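Assemble and predict.
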Amino acid sequence: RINTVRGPITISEVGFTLTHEHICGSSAGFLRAWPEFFGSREALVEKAVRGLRRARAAGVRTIVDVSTFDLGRDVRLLAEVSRAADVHIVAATGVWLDPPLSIRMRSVEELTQFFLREIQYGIEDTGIRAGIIKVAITGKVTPFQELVLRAAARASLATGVPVITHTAGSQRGGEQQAAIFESEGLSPSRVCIGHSDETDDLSYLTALAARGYLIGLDRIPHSAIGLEDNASATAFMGSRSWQTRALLIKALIDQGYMKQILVSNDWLFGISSYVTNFMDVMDSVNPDGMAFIPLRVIPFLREKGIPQETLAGITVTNPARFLSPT
Amino acid sequence: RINTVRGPITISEVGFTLTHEHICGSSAGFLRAWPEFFGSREALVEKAVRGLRRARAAGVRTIVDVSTFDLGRDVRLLAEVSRAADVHIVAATGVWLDPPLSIRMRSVEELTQFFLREIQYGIEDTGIRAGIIKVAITGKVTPFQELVLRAAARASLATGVPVITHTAGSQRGGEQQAAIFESEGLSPSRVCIGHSDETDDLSYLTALAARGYLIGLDRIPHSAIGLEDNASATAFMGSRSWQTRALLIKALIDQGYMKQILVSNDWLFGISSYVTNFMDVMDSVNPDGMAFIPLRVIPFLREKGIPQETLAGITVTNPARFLSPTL
Ligand SMILES: [Zn+2]
Ligand SMILES: [Zn+2]
Ligand SMILES: [Zn+2]
Ligand SMILES: [Zn+2]
Ligand SMILES: [Zn+2]
Ligand SMILES: [Zn+2]
């Protein structure tokens, strides 16, 4: 069974899953301290519900919010929006790239306990339990990031809950992360190497896939083509077309690794951790939001000749095998 | 009228005030996400209530908790402890040394609006309003720190609430902050240069006091060495005696600046922003806690010939004048 913000669900209920999304990209405590940054908490809720409903209609039944403590994860916000939109939402524990001092001063043993509290007992005082662990690195894994990766591994081994990662920028850190995970004894089938669509290095992708890693092709709609004049847009969404990103799905299918692919939008409905009004920039690029995958991508892959059954297998079977604890 | 976590109080109700303290030194959202780091929320409350009742029995009537959003300020915690201990607590807005991305990506205009929200409307959804603005800088003022200093000057000018600031990683350094504040039109009488007891340079402090700045001699008990083993307790506390620090109070009095002096402990009852069990190290060197000032420093200055009325001016009159919103 899989933990959601509304409680436990069966594999069968999971359905069509977007495994890499956010309701809001922020910082710990920020939404509670300055809700007016988003207009109001009430507007943010309405926008998230009006978006999750358009995706639900397009077939989406589950999303995984990979927002950690330090990404401003507000679990009560997740519950409100999930219940209102009637779409499953899996919450995360772990540590992203903006840990405050109270997190970054902690040991591997302490960080392990923290992830365990959030998976086994609940997030804050809510009883809502994390379904996944999200970690991140920059360039070469820093000493602190190594502690986080090791703690994430130990937590996964204790609870069966999977791990999702990424490396800042377009850097290909999967091999370095994979090395640390395996030194802890973690099975690659419990790990997704995320943001893998930031690169066109197919040898890199296939090799990880061949080892059993899930390949997170999850920023498909991100593209600053047309926004060349907006330097902050480029740094965030890149210069590669969404088509180029989506073709990596085909390419990996064509190598026989369909069972290892996870597809998503890495979207959200508010963001405060970047430049002001960046949400409006993203919205002007991908008006379909979280519906971009079921609506505009699936047909694309359908057109290029991928069998419907293979897609269903990627959008339903894969997420379920991934999310289901072991 | 001065805002506290229990509502507005009149100037006469403030009494003996510790102008630079914390209930807990943490990170935003952390106490709510990992209360077990402190044993439990319930354990932290009990420890803080006992600590504040001790201070109160030593004469303390108000403290100023200078904890910002990014220092993990929890105003519901402050309200609970204030009520239980019957000690007034003034809450803070501002930015300390650990802003998350959602803060450090903001413009001067945005930070001003944030501080104003916390002073004029309330903190989070509690209706509790900040009565002071806390800012911090390092070495040479960073571009972002300059933004914070200016936003703080602007919020002060709009509300009359005072500003407390300090320089981490160096003694001196108040001149930078003074230049920036004054460039914005802020009266020095609205500004306390905190952690000033960390310097021995008396000419530097007197010069600031003569410009009208308030001098925060507010880490007196952090002198503590004893523990040569820890490169974390002599790099976070020091190597001088608390007496040498307290003598700076006498020294500024003797120069005729008694009205410009604020005195405090910079204590707390939990801390998560440094090494695990740093609280135990702190408690071992100063078991008096926030009572350190009234139990050790006051008697010490008394024995040095400082009269009652001067001591009361420093601990009662100065803080009331400082905190009373003045435009
Ligand atoms: Zn990421
Ligand atoms: Zn992502
Ligand atoms: Zn993401
Ligand atoms: Zn300080
Ligand atoms: Zn201080
Ligand atoms: Zn302090």
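The domain at 1-327 of chain B is CATH 3.20.20.140 (TIM Barrel).
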